[PDB]
Amino acid sequence: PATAKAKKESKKQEEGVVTNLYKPKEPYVGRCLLNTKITGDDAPGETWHMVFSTEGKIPYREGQSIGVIADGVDKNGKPHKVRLYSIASSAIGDFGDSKTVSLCVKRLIYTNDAGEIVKGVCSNFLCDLQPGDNVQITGPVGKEMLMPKDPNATIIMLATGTGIAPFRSFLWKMFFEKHDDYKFNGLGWLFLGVPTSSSLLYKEEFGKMKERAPENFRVDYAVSREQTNAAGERMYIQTRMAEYKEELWELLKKDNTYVYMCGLKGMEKGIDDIMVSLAEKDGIDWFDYKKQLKRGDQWNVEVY
Numbered sequence: 001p002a003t004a005k006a007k008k009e010s011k012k013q014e015e016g017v018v019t020n021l022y023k024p025k026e027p028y029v030g031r032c033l034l035n036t037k038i039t040g041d042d043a044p045g046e047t048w049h050m051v052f053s054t055e056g057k058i059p060y061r062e063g064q065s066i067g068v069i070a071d072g073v074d075k076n077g078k079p080h081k082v083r084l085y086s087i088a089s090s091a092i093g094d095f096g097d098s099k100t101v102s103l104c105v106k107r108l109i110y111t112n113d114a115g116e117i118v119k120g121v122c123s124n125f126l127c128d129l130q131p132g133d134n135v136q137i138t139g140p141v142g143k144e145m146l147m148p149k150d151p152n153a154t155i156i157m158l159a160t161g162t163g164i165a166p167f168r169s170f171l172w173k174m175f176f177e178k179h180d181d182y183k184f185n186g187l188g189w190l191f192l193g194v195p196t197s198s199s200l201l202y203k204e205e206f207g208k209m210k211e212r213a214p215e216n217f218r219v220d221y222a223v224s225r226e227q228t229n230a231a232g233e234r235m236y237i238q239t240r241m242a243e244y245k246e247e248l249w250e251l252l253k254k255d256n257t258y259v260y261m262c263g264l265k266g267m268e269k270g271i272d273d274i275m276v277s278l279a280e281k282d283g284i285d286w287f288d289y290k291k292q293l294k295r296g297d298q299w300n301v302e303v304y
């Protein structure tokens with residue numbers, strides 16, 4: 001139309017997306033409905049899946065995050081700083097009523113070289129929540145991990161640990177829900193890297209997804225302490241990807257292929273390493289190429 005269109009058109013679903021509806025000064029006070037440990041007792045970290053009531057007052061979209069202000073005060077009697085957490089539920093939610101939001105939280109605990117145990121403020125606060133407890137929420141936040149508009153896109157999801165969160169959100173909308181305006185028929189390929197089998201988050205859910213959409217969904221796990229490749233190397237996410245290096249490289253050259261990466265900071269290095277060798281097989285500089293993919297919204301990263 002002969003209408004004014006000054007702004008730039010993205011390839012992601014930005015229409016109707018809201019950010020920072022609730023801020024630290026006046027957060028939304030939700031309530032814990034459920035909180036379940038989803039890792040095995042032998043897992044080295046301990047991750048919990050929790051659901052909060054929102055009364056539908058927080059219209060978040062798949063891929064966004066919310067902030068959590070843990071109860072308590074710091075030394076100066078001031079509130080705790082906000083900690084961000086990727087939303088692990090679809091917009092409709094685990095209860096299917098558009099009135100809740102779910103988080104996938106790893107309890108941060110470690111011993112320093114003094115033998116002293118240190119505990120993260122917000123992660124331990126969240127994991128200790130009991131149904132009925134109040135929680136201060138802010139946001140929603142983020143535009144980086146929003147889903148592609150293309151219902152027939154090839155979506156490659158690379159995740160480590162809790163980085164699986166935004167992808168569980170994607171996948172629920174793609175395969176577990178009926179949307180009259182969005183019918184996914186592309187290819188969803190998930191790569192999830194964790195240390196042990198007892199750390200395999202939402203495995204049962206992805207299994208049911210593979211069952212009802214066998215030709216639209218593929219999953220590959222990388223358990224570093226239990227698997228190894230022919231060369232005898234630990235199976236990290238990049239190591240598993242290397243088994244499909246030919247296929248992944250070919251997919252990246254397509255216009256409807258979108259890569260999303262979420263998880264532990266540093267996972268990008270290992271992935272770049274595998275890409276640099278592939279890129280030079282065609283006389284291409286990976287970093288110059290990645291920059292191009294980014295401009296086209298085909299390489300989205302959110303690590304921490």
Ligand SMILES: Cc1cc2nc3c(=O)[nH]c(=O)nc-3n(C[C@H](O)[C@H](O)[C@H](O)COP(=O)(O)OP(=O)(O)OC[C@H]3O[C@@H](n4cnc5c(N)ncnc54)[C@H](O)[C@@H]3O)c2cc1C
Pocket residue numbers: 065083084085086087104105106107108110119120121122123124162163165302304
């Ligand atoms: C966009 C975004 C999305 C996120 N999504 C999620 C999510 O879905 N799930 C999730 O669990 N977290 C997520 N996080 C991380 C989360 O925001 C917190 O950083 C994390 O929970 C730790 O906060 P804390 O208050 O418990 O600990 P804090 O008291 O803040 O303490 C952290 C301190 O410990 C150090 N530290 C951090 N990790 C470790 C470690 N593994 N071992 C040793 N020392 C460490 C830090 O350098 C820092 O000094 C996300 C972060 C961002 C920015």
